[PDB]
């Protein structure tokens, strides 16, 4: 273990959700993840047990407001008559899955979205496609890049499906095979990957299904710069996001020998989330570190 990131650095993450379909999720992200992170690292007594209830109310409030954007199909978009976003619907899946520990979450809402992605947006080769990009391109983190898009997006959607699996097992029959077809696409193409970001994200996707091994694992691990980070020329934020996915992959692998320099690089970023364009870095860095604090010896 390493020291937990100090609660005080996280106070600004307790945020009102507002706006429409997209921006309501931008608001919901930080409070969701800050409560997740603080619950895991047990900082509530020495910080404000009662501020937790307030955050729980805000989360309840984002969830509730988000249902006003649920389309008949079970998909999501900024507005109810907007064509539904594959990325957004998968992202609502990602956040609500993590919030099952925190508030009432309706399975049918969550699994409905899962089912729609599989049924509507997955290709026969297992790729997921976005037919209606979100307005808020700053909220999709390193996916905003144009290269390696089918692999980055497919890994992103696959990750949501894997995080919804326990909750949706009994009601989405198609789910296990959808997971495998997506894995198949990622595995077949993983070795050709050029981008550190795509390597880290597809690596976490693959690892969760025990498919990151052999030459693919070696690819994953040797893409790290100095054994501590996954980075590309671009915004630093994508690199904190990619390194956080890579840490989740390491944790899945139980590669605790590789872990500590990666945790030290992240901690030394002093990246406390929040702000325009921070949705993916904020969610992912705190998901990763909470997982790290939960798992690591």
């Amino acid at each position: 273990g390493s020291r937990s990131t100090d609660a005080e650095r996280l106070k600004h993450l307790i945020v009102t959700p507002s706006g429409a379909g997209e921006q309501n999720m931008i608001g919901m992200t930080p409070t969701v993840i800050a409560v997740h992170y603080l619950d895991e690292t047990e900082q509530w007594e020495k910080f404000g047990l009662e501020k937790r209830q307030g955050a729980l109310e805000l989360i309840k409030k984002g969830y509730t407001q988000q249902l006003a954007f649920r389309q008949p199909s079970s998909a999501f978009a900024a507005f109810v008559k907007r064509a539904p976003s594959t990325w957004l619907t998968a992202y609502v899946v990602k956040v609500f899955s993590l919030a099952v520990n925190l508030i009432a979450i309706d399975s049918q809402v969550l699994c409905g979205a899962v089912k729609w992605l599989i049924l509507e947006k997955q290709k026969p080769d297992g790729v997921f496609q976005e037919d209606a990009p979100v307005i808020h391109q700053e909220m999709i983190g390193g996916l905003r890049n144009n290269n390696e898009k089918d692999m980055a997006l497919t890994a992103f959607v696959l990750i949501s499906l894997q995080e919804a699996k326990d909750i949706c097992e009994e009601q989405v029959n198609s789910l296990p095979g959808s997971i495998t077809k997506a894995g198949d696409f990622l595995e077949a193409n993983y070795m050709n990957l050029q981008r550190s970001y795509t390597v880290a994200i597809a690596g976490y996707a693959l690892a969760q299904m025990g498919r990151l091994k052999g030459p693919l694992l070696n690819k994953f691990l040797t893409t790290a710069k100095d054994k501590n980070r996954w980075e590309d020329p671009g915004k630093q934020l994508y690199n904190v996001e990619a390194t956080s996915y890579a840490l989740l992959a390491l944790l899945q692998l139980k590669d605790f020998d590789f872990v500590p320099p990666v945790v030290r690089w992240l901690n030394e970023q002093r990246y406390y989330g929040g702000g325009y364009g921070s949705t993916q870095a904020t969610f992912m860095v705190f998901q990763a570190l909470a997982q790290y604090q939960k798992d690591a010896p």
Binding site: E45, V100, L102, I167
Partner: protein, 65 residues
């Protein structure tokens, strides 16, 4: 129909953990009970609400560590 047993078990798990939240009022227990509840089938739509309502109530009371 192992699928009946699963659903039946989710229910007991949720009943058990909600009863236990009610006993300790911890964040830890809250988290267990809330997930458990959200895991119960719409098949038991009724007892699911009652357990959820039970959770919200322990939350009104207030948590302690």
């Amino acid at each position: 129909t192992d699928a009946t047993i699963k659903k039946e078990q989710k229910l007991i798990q949720a009943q058990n953990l909600v009863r236990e939240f009610e006993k300790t009022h911890t964040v830890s227990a809250h988290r267990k009970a809330q997930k458990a509840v959200n895991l119960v089938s719409f098949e038991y739509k009724v007892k699911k609400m009652v357990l959820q309502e039970r959770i919200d109530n322990v939350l009104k009371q207030g948590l302690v560590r």
